[PDB]
Ligand binder design. Structure first.
Ligand SMILES: Cc1ccc(OCCN(C)C)cc1C(=O)N[C@H](C)c1cc(-c2cnn(C)c2)cc(-c2cncs2)c1
Ligand SMILES: [Cl-]
Ligand SMILES: [Cl-]
Ligand SMILES: [Cl-]
Ligand SMILES: [Zn+2]
Ligand SMILES: [Zn+2]
Ligand SMILES: [Zn+2]
Ligand SMILES: [Zn+2]
Ligand SMILES: [Zn+2]
Length: 296
C-alpha cells in the first residue's frame, strides 16, 4: 500500500519499486532500486504523483517542496537509530551525529506551550513527549533544511519551528525613546541581544535612527525567548524555565540544556547533572509569561 501521510493509505498492486510507484521509501530507506519481495509485499511512502496524494501531503505536512519527503525519510533513517532516554521526566536524545542542538531543542519544547500547525508535527510532538521522538526529530530536520550531522543553532531551529506554529495570539508592544511598535507572532516571542527578561522590561540601549533605549510595554504570550551571544551567565532557582548552554567555538561548539526544577538540572545528552546554582556560558534563556503590562 502507498501512503503519503500514513493516515490515508491507498492500495496498490520483479519490476523495481521506483519504476512502478516513483520514489518509494520503506522505514526511511529508499527502495527505489529494490525489487518487490514476498517480505516487502506493507506500507510504503511515495512522493505524490497524483492530486489526491498531493492534497493529502499538504494536509499533513503543509509543504509542497517535493524534496521534503526525501529529506524527511533520509533524516528518519538516522533518528530511529538514536536512543531517546528520559531524564528527569523529559525526553532527551543520546548524543549522536551532532544532535546536541536537537536534544536541547527537544528538551526545551516539552517545557514550553506550543501548538504546531502541520498535523505531522503535532502528532510527532505528542509522540515525542511520550518518549517516541524519532519522527519528531526527523521532521525538525526536514522543515529546517538541515541534514543529519550538520551543525545547527538552537535559536534558529526554534525560529523556524515557531514559524510553523500558532503564534497569532502572541503579541509584543515595544517603545523606543516616544515611538512604540507592535510585534506579532514569532517576533513577539524572540528577542536577540540580552538574556535577562527583566532587563528587556527595564530597557536596553539600541541604536537610534536619529542618533536610544528599547523597553517592553506589553506581552501577551505563553512564553518569551531571550537570546544573546554566548557569555558567562548566572542562573537562579525559579527565575527561568530553561536555558541552553553553548561551550565551544562558532558552529563547532557543543549544546547543553539547563532546566529549573526544585534544583537546577543540567542535561547533556543522556547525562544529567544537578546543582543549586549554575554559572556558565548561556546563549538562550526561556521565560514563562502569560500577560505583561508595563508600569511605565
Ligand atoms: C552550533 C552552531 C551551528 C550553526 C550555526 O549557524 C549560524 C549561522 N546561520 C546563519 C546559519 C551557529 C552555531 C553556533 O555556534 N551558535 C552559537 C549559539 C553561537 C552564536 C554566536 C552568535 C549569534 N549571533 N551573534 C551575533 C553571535 C556566536 C558564537 C561564537 C562566536 N565565537 C565563539 S562562539 C556561537
Ligand atoms: Cl502553510
Ligand atoms: Cl505551518
Ligand atoms: Cl519563568
Ligand atoms: Zn502550515
Ligand atoms: Zn546516523
Ligand atoms: Zn530619532
Ligand atoms: Zn532555591
Ligand atoms: Zn554537539
Amino acid at each position: 500500500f502507498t501512503t503519503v501521510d500514513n493516515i490515508n493509505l491507498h492500495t496498490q498492486v520483479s519490476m523495481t519499486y521506483g519504476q512502478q510507484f516513483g520514489p518509494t521509501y520503506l522505514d526511511g530507506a529508499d527502495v527505489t532500486k529494490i525489487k518487490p519481495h514476498n517480505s516487502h509485499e506493507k506500507t510504503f511512502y511515495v512522493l505524490p504523483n497524483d492530486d489526491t496524494l498531493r492534497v493529502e501531503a499538504f494536509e499533513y505536512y503543509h509543504t509542497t517542496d517535493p524534496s521534503f519527503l526525501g529529506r524527511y525519510m533520509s533524516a528518519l533513517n538516522h533518528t530511529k537509530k538514536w536512543k531517546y532516554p528520559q531524564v528527569n521526566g523529559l525526553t532527551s536524545i543520546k548524543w549522536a551525529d551532532n544532535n546536541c542542538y536537537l536534544a536541547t531543542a527537544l528538551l526545551t519544547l516539552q517545557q514550553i506551550e506550543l501548538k504546531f500547525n502541520p498535523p505531522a508535527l503535532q502528532d510527532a510532538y505528542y509522540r515525542a513527549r511520550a518518549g517516541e521522538a524519532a519522527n519528531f526529530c526527523a521532521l525538525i530536520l526536514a522543515y529546517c533544511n538541515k541534514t543529519v550531522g550538520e551543525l545547527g543553532d538552537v535559536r534558529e531551529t526554534m525560529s523556524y519551528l515557531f514559524q510553523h506554529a500558532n503564534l497569532d495570539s502572541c503579541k509584543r508592544v515595544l517603545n523606543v525613546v516616544q515611538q512604540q511598535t507592535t510585534l506579532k507572532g514569532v517576533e513577539a516571542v524572540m528577542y536577540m541581544g540580552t538574556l535577562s527578561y527583566e532587563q528587556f522590561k527595564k530597557g536596553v540601549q539600541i541604536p537610534c535612527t536619529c542618533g536610544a533605549t528599547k523597553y517592553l510595554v506589553q506581552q501577551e504570550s505563553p512564553f518569551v525567548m531571550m537570546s544573546a551571544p554566548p557569555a558567562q551567565y548566572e542562573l537562579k532557582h525559579g527565575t527561568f524555565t530553561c536555558a541552553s548552554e553553548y561551550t565551544g567555538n562558532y558552529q563547532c561548539g557543543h549544546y547543553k540544556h539547563i532546566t529549573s526544577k526544585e534544583t537546577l538540572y543540567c542535561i547533556d545528552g543522556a547525562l544529567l547533572t544537578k546543582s543549586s546554582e549554575y554559572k556558565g556560558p548561556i546563549t538562550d534563556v526561556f521565560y514563562k509569561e502569560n500577560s505583561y503590562t508595563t508600569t511605565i
